[PDB]
């Protein structure tokens, strides 16, 4: 049951701030130290800073100096990278990690990731299309159109349907917005009577749609 | 200043083979510093696993078909038996320095026997049309290799630079990839034409594969 | 109540071998690292090998590389340091050390040292004799602690109880090859009558434990 | 390889004096390779202490008198107003390199005003006369500074060569001395003599003290 989770990202324009958490469980932060990581989309992990939450020790990477602070509150578990200055460049998924027992230069456990993205653009909610199928395999789908920022998750008949099931990463259009679509391949003896619904959800516009996908009349 | 270089950047090796993944630093550096060089094993939408630590040591938990090794300023990773589930980026990481940093990252692809793609075509829904937009799609479905050449035409037209493609991960279980290709048409081009064909070139084909509809049949 | 205390030191042939082990309480040697420390005879301090017990990992430094070992046992929260080929150049105490929390390279507590000395010649205990109370209103008096080797001994005041003006020798050899010193203490001349004092007297080596009453002379 | 040169190897100040003592790195190492310099100290008889750890963190329960810093390659360790009990031996630690490797060490002594010596003289026991061998020995207490002579005579015969000395450390609260001078004679040369005299010259002292006995009385 050790855990690390991060939260707080989101768009943000360039020149803002923005501030990350990372609450532990399982362990206390103050046994250890706690680490930033990021990645930039189709990236390599660049570290970006570390503390020592018991006596406040930290250090950075030359390329967020000035701008990320690290910190951390022992008695909430909790620590925080405040980002300042933003610029197009630190988008990236952010991950915390720490080192445990007394094995120093070892991220062994490391949080889900929180996505930073910095941009100009509006955050703008998806429009969800039908893939319509026409004693084989048929293929069905969901065209997930015109969003932003990332991400989007699809789901198929709310988590039941998983064997089949393609969602493609996301393409960036050339107007800004993103597109993707979810695919899956069924009997095509389930068609008549079988129902098929893809949940979309694009949590950073409030967006969910649940779109039923059949053969056209 | 110092930097790992791994090698090679990229490969495929069949499920039971050897792996050896390299990482150099960047320059000569004393014997008396110590790297404490660690592996990190990266699957897609994925953090980071620890796979190996302090140059050799194997995680809690981790395959023992995963060590790691070094002999001065050269580390490496290898992975005694390739299973389709290593497919990943696999990322070295020096902490000769504070900051410690990464390695550029190695892609290990699972090299399976050659599959050919499923292929559908999919019209622009009604609902679509009304937005003033055509989008036609072209699925490849769980094919192996991943390279696919896919071509789009309209009435005969070749389309050049109207598409995009999203191509899905390397399954963990099967080894294979899917594919779409999204064709983008105005809603007054997509009705003024009638034959819509996508035309797959893969390895696992003889011959390129046409799956085609006409605009307003079923 | 963090304590290290070590053991096994004491006098031992050139070319001959020692354990010495380092027992601790107060917390646990699996949640940290061990370290041995020596310091030969008016020098400075040389590290010796450090120890992570959780995975039995060791480094060691060059000068004994080869002829230490460091290990440890964690069900005894005890870890050791074997010495063999010991050398002239070993002869020193050597002191045991940790980390605490997760705060790296800061040896936050130490144990008391233990001394191991590398000879050809033999033990041999001391004898004690009474430096007795023969300047204004304080008299001296004290224990001449005679021909023992090898070093050390210790010497307390009634059992203890008395550290107040008490000065005890740094040892001197003498040209026997053996060591001596005085343990003296300074206290009210008004005291001789009625209060006792003895000097508790220890050479571990040998085996030799002597208490013994300094009173004015008949 | 990579070293600490600590300089001076040894300083004397006054109670209340300000002293700084130095580190340097033996030669040049990138600014990207951390040193973590730690800082001890040593009393006479007892195992190093911590007093800093990476660089300049004061370590728990020190006196706040005691601080680090460091720049470049070059550490300092600095006793803001100097006492007493902080005479001792000063060794830094680098850890650039594993293994780590201390500096020299640097002994602070404590400057103080100066005290003669009390003088003390005691024949040989009657115990150790039994085992043949006859020592006297003379003590000089609690006395500033170090510098002292002590000359034996018996039945004024000058004593060369057959005597030895030993000093303590200065002490942790008077910053004084003592010193035994041991004169060791066979029983049969103590038996032939009379008057044993042990004659102190110290600054302290305005002529030279002397203290006798005569054997058997
Ligand atoms: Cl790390
Ligand atoms: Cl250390
Ligand atoms: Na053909």
């Known amino acids: 049951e050790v855990q690390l989770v991060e939260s707080g990202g989101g768009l943000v324009q360039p020149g803002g701030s923005l501030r990350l958490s990372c609450?532990?469980?399982?362990?206390?932060?103050?046994?250890?130290?706690?680490?930033?990581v990021r990645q930039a989309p189709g990236k390599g992990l660049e570290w970006?800073?570390?503390?020592?939450?018991?006596?406040?020790?930290?250090?950075?990477?030359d390329s967020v100096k000035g701008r990320f602070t690290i910190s951390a509150d022992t008695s909430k578990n909790t620590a925080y990278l405040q980002m300042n200055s933003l610029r197009a460049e630190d988008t990236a998924v952010?991950?915390?990690?720490?080192?445990?027992?007394?094995?120093?230069?070892?991220?062994?456990?490391?949080?889900?990731g929180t996505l930073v993205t910095v941009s100009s653009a509006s955050t703008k909610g998806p429009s969800v299309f039908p893939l319509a199928p026409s004693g084989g395999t048929a293929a069905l789908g969901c065209l997930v159109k015109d969003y932003f920022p990332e991400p989007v998750t699809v789901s198929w008949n709310s988590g039941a349907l998983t064997s089949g099931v393609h969602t493609f990463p996301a393409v960036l259009q050339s107007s800004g917005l993103y597109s993707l679509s979810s695919v899956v391949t069924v009997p095509s003896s389930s068609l008549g009577t079988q129902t098929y619904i893809c949940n979309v959800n694009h949590k950073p516009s409030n967006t969910k749609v649940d779109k039923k996908v059949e053969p056209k009349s | 200043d110092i930097q790992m270089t791994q090698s090679p950047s990229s490969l495929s090796a069949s499920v039971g083979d050897r792996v050896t993944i390299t990482c150099?630093?960047?320059?000569?550096?004393?014997?008396?510093?110590?790297?404490?060089?660690?592996?990190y094993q990266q699957k897609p939408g994925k953090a980071p696993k620890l796979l190996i630590y302090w140059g050799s040591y194997l995680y809690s938990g981790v395959p023992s078909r995963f060590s790691g090794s070094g002999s001065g300023t050269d580390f490496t990773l290898t992975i005694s038996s390739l299973q389709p589930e290593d497919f990943a980026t696999?990322?070295?990481?020096?902490?000769?320095?504070?900051?410690?940093?990464?390695?550029?990252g190695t892609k290990v692809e699972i090299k399976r026997t050659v599959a050919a793609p499923s292929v559908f075509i999919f019209p622009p829904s009604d609902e679509q049309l009304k937005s003033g937009t055509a989008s036609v799609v072209c699925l490849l479905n769980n094919f192996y290799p991943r390279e696919a050449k896919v071509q789009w035409k309209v009435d005969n037209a070749l389309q050049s630079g109207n598409s995009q493609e999203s191509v899905t991960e390397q399954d963990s279980k099967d080894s294979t990839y899917s594919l779409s290709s999204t064709l983008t048409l105005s809603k007054a081009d997509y009705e003024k034409h009638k034959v819509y064909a996508c035309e797959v070139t893969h390895q696992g084909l003889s011959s390129p594969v046409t799956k085609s509809f006409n605009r307003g049949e079923c | 109540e963090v304590q290290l205390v070590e053991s096994g030191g004491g006098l031992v042939q050139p070319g001959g071998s020692l354990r010495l082990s380092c027992a601790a309480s107060?917390?646990?040697?699996?949640?940290?690292?061990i370290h041995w420390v020596r310091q030969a005879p008016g020098k400075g301090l040389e590290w010796v090998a450090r120890?992570?017990?959780?995975?039995?990992?060791?480094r060691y430094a060059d000068s004994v590389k080869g002829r230490f070992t460091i290990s440890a046992d964690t069900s005894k929260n005890t870890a050791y340091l074997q010495m063999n080929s010991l050398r002239a150049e070993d002869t020193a105490v050597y002191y045991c050390?940790?980390?605490?929390?997760?705060?790296?390279?800061?040896?936050?507590?130490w144990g008391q040292g233990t001394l191991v000395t590398v000879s050809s010649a033999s033990t041999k205990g001391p004898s004690v004799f009474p430096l007795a109370p023969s300047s204004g209103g304080t008299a001296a008096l004290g224990c001449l602690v005679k021909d023992y080797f090898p070093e050390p001994v210790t010497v307390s005041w009634n059992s203890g109880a008395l550290t107040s003006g008490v000065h005890t020798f740094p040892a001197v050899l003498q040209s026997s090859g053996l060591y001596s010193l005085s343990s003296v203490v300074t206290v009210p001349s008004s005291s001789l009558g009625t209060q006792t004092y003895i000097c508790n007297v220890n050479h571990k080596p040998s085996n030799t434990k002597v208490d013994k009453k300094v009173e004015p002379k008949s | 390889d990579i070293q600490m040169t600590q300089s001076p190897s040894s300083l004397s100040a006054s109670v209340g004096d300000r002293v700084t003592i130095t580190c340097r790195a033996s030669?040049?190492?990138?600014?990207?390779?951390?040193?973590?310099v730690a800082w001890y100290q040593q009393k006479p008889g007892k195992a190093p202490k911590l007093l800093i750890y990476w660089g300049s963190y004061l370590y728990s329960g020190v006196p706040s008198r005691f601080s680090g810093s460091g720049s470049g390659t070059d550490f300092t360790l600095t006793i803001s107003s100097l006492q007493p009990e902080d005479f001792a031996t000063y060794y830094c630690?680098?850890?650039?390199?594993?293994?780590?490797?201390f500096g020299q060490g640097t002994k602070v002594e404590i400057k103080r005003t100066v005290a003669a010596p009390s003088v003390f003289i005691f024949p040989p026991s009657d115990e150790q006369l039994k085992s043949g061998t006859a020592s006297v020995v003379c003590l000089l207490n609690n006395f500033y500074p170090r510098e002292a002579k002590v000359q034996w005579k018996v039945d004024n015969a000058l004593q060369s060569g057959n005597s030895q000395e030993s000093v303590t450390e200065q002490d942790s609260k008077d910053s004084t001395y003592s010193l035994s001078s041991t004169l060791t004679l066979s029983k049969a040369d103590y038996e032939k003599h009379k008057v044993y005299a042990c004659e102190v010259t110290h600054q302290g002292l305005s002529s030279p003290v002397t203290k006798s006995f005569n054997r058997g009385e």
């Open positions: 107060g917390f646990n040697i699996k949640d940290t690292w």
């Open positions: 050390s940790r980390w605490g929390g997760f705060m790296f390279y800061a040896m936050d507590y």
């Open positions: 030669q040049d190492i990138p600014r990207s390779i951390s040193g973590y």
């Open positions: 120890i992570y017990p959780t995975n039995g990992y060791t």
């Open positions: 630690q680098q850890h650039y390199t594993t293994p780590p490797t």
